Amino acid sequence: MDYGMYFFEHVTPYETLVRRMERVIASGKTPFQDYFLFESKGFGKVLILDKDVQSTERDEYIYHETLVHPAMLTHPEPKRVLIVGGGEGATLREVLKHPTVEKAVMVDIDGELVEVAKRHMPEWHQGAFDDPRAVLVIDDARAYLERTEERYDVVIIDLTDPVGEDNPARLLYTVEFYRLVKAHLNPGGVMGMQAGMILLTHHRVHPVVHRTVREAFRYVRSYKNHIPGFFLNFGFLLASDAFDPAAFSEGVIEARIRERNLALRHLTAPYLEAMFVLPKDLLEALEKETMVSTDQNPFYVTPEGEARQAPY
């Protein structure tokens, strides 16, 4: 391809995405991770955290819609919402889009990266932060969830795979963490989350996530969607003790979409319910999975993609 500036995105240990930069808007170091924000011609601005794309501007709508709305849509009347992780302000954006929302609290360990999302990714946050109903909190979720005891109707979890042994994002993907999410939910409340890529042909982050969350939640329902941006099939899930969040009654998602006036660009009612219908190979793997990650023994993925587990 053309010669010039490029970014070597890791993807899998055998497949690297080399992606053209037209211009480096911003790049640096926080006390928690590396960022690069550059100008893709294809997807506009792109944001790497560490060695992995985080979002792209022209496609983020697909990911943010797919992460939020299936959880909000699947709750009858979402009033208080917690967003764990998710610093660009887009999860916020789509959460704020539901009018039954009075409060939306967003937590996220890394200030300067938010400060970066704000200075340089207006396209994302879109004003979000400065909405009255919002409350930025810069802490570690596990810390936040242990100290406060406010409760929520939906929690959205938008965190970063727990990759490699040393990583401390690991103590966020244990069952203890999810009972801890659970501990903070009203009755009728639902959890929503990104759970890692599916490429089940290498590997296993998605199904262990599903299995582990299963140990804290009665009803765990796993859905999927292609983020073009990532060139990758991403796994998400919905969880609840209170009811099966994917028994979708005829006409109802659509009902709510109207009442609520959702400006949507990717999702429609039937597409949304489609995300939930999985190929057989995804079913089988989701079923074969037995690893449950625990505080005692937190799971991580090898840099070969394999699921390991040991103390921290």
Add this chain to the structure above:
Amino acid sequence: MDYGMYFFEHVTPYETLVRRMERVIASGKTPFQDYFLFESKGFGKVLILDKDVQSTERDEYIYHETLVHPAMLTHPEPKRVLIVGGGEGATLREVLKHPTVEKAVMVDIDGELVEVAKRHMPEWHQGAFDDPRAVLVIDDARAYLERTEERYDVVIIDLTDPVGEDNPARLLYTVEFYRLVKAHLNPGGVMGMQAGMILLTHHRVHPVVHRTVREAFRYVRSYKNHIPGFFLNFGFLLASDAFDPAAFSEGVIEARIRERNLALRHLTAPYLEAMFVLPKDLLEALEKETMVSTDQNPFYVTPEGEARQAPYK
């Protein structure tokens, strides 16, 4: 990211996929294309044509299941199948998987490539090529179905995005070609084919392949699925002049699976039928596409990776 052998695989003009080569198994230069077959730790053997990967081992089951059986399961008792393209002949193996089938004519320019597939790609063909029902034909499929009056229930067009001005195979991408295909159908007959990546920010290959086909059949149904080893969302479609191929029942597709003892590894009735549920953006992209392609001005793929029309040189 190591050192060692890598492939450099075009994905669009701004994203390139660098793949780690465990060992080249065979490359060379047929009079119709460049090819590299190699061994990766990720997807088993990988196959490249010019700058793109035709197919991967660990995951071609998916692409092929997706391509074929829609079209096949939507036909109530298919007997005569045209497979245009598909050197590998996994396209054949999936087809030869339906009982009903008496004769499947595989038609493909590049028998030297087909030979590689034979010699090196067992994993794909799985004897498909020596089925007493297969007719290997070694010609430009446009010459063939023009040079014959033979009839079919299902065509399956397993071709390849037709890149660049200079290419006799942009002629496989026009409403006169899809008409040729149409003319060569039985009364119940359905086409089903592959129709490009879906990557709405770089280009409109899929929509335009779809627009081209809306022009030569009543009913055009796009479906798509995610092919892991491509790292792409691929776009497919079905077209027929008879029924809407998309308004099936889900009870019936199930019927015909269990019925014809299809071994499936990816598809299920539910999943299959869902592939046909498109998100708002993509339905618009389709309902908004205009460019139809014709022998007169065929469309090719710009090396900026978008749809363009221009007259026939």
Add this chain to the structure above:
Amino acid sequence: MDYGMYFFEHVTPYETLVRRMERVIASGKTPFQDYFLFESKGFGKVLILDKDVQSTERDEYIYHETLVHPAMLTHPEPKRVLIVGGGEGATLREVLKHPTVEKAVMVDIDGELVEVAKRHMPEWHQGAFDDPRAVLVIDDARAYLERTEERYDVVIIDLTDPVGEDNPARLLYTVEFYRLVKAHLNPGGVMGMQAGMILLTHHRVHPVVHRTVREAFRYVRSYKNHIPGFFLNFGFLLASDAFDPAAFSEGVIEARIRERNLALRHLTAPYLEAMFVLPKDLLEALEKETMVSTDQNPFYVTPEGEARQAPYK
């Protein structure tokens, strides 16, 4: 090999140098070229023009020492210097290092680039540009020395390999151009210039630049040296109509160094004079080169990276 930002730097058509970008400092697109200045751990700030690196910080001292002082030290008391090209103005700083010098006219298309150098490349220019002896001229150096009757003792041609058919700067690579240069010399006067990589298996840029110049001066001496940050063997030369610029004494070059209190960091009298000792292969390549380039058929660099002649469009 990590992840992070990389440059992709053309070296030939089959070797590419991927350089790790610590931080882009400034890129953009002047009406004459693309440019990227960035920060690497290896060589400090790196500067790219189109697909090649003009210069590196930790090691430009070398390229510049090598370019300039030969030519300068071979002239017994240089006063008036033409510097064609050399945006960075390290070419200036080295020149402005000789006492004898009264006036150095730097002449260079692209003042926007020169501005980058000013704003971002202090390390290079080192005030060179504000020497009461420097005349920044912002024109096509071919227009300039054609549009003037001014005279010089040393010219120094710090241009750039002239790649591709379309380029008004292939006109800076002909015997009519080097004659223009000649015509604009004093009686003792010497040219010295940069003359391409030396990479005898891919191409004959150096020999051909040399052959072109043999045509417009009596005495042509190739010398070369290894520029680390390029990972290339670069080729240079001196030409004069007066003496052989190559038959110096080594006692004398030493004289003139100590004499003019040249701070040197790379060159020494011995080393400098040795750059002029070529191996068998390279002397043949030179004695075997034929292609001369002319306004009539100027030579450009093929994107297969070899010398080609073709008439003026």
Add this chain to the structure above:
Amino acid sequence: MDYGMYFFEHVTPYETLVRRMERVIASGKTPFQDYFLFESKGFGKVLILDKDVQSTERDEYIYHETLVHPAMLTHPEPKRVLIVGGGEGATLREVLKHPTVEKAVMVDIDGELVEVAKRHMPEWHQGAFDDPRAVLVIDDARAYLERTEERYDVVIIDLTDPVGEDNPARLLYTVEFYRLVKAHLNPGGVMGMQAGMILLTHHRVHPVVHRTVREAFRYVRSYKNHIPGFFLNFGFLLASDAFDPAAFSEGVIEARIRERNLALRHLTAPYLEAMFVLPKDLLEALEKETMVSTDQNPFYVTPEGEARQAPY
């Protein structure tokens, strides 16, 4: 650049050479290193060992000439020669080119790679092996030199940088190793060697080599030359107790070149003596160097290029 097969050659930690392969002649694993032999269009066949180019076919003549002949030329009458390392059979080739040679013994730890040089690099060895005067020995040099006690007029050392901590090529770049080379030399004998790249702008393999060899040899003279193949300025040296191997008398290298009938393609007499005249920056660094690598404390280069030293 074009799309297709490529090889990612390491070079420096900040600069990688990505080099086009037209065809993979051969590649595999020995019990000691990795090989890849491929078809460059530029340089013809190329041979990687591990992650580093070893030779290229159209340019090897430059490297092999530059490694051998300055040592052989600088000996009055070279009869017995030892070549440590150097498995392609090219050092052999040029050593055999001097007619005063009756025996030439070549040692090299890795059989299968020789077996590979023979099956697939005819261009290199050129018959070499099958010359009567030659004697292939497949051992570790240090082992070979400790067991036998034959002696030699020139030793050529053509080994592979000692790179990274775990590497066992390290015990080959100590002073004890060179006293051990020395221990095996007739009087009037000279050592010749590749000593690593010069890029003194990163780093230091060349000057420590020079300094260490200096501790076993009275006269160590360091010369250099650009191998196009490697895109890199490579450092070599000549050593002797018996006399200054780079006091070059007027007309003498040339004298010997004639008498001996050297078919040379790169070197000439004056070029050969030129290699010995170094830039100031190379002089200064050669002089500032103080690290001497020892059995007790073997030196290696960091993967950042820095010279370290500790026990093994």
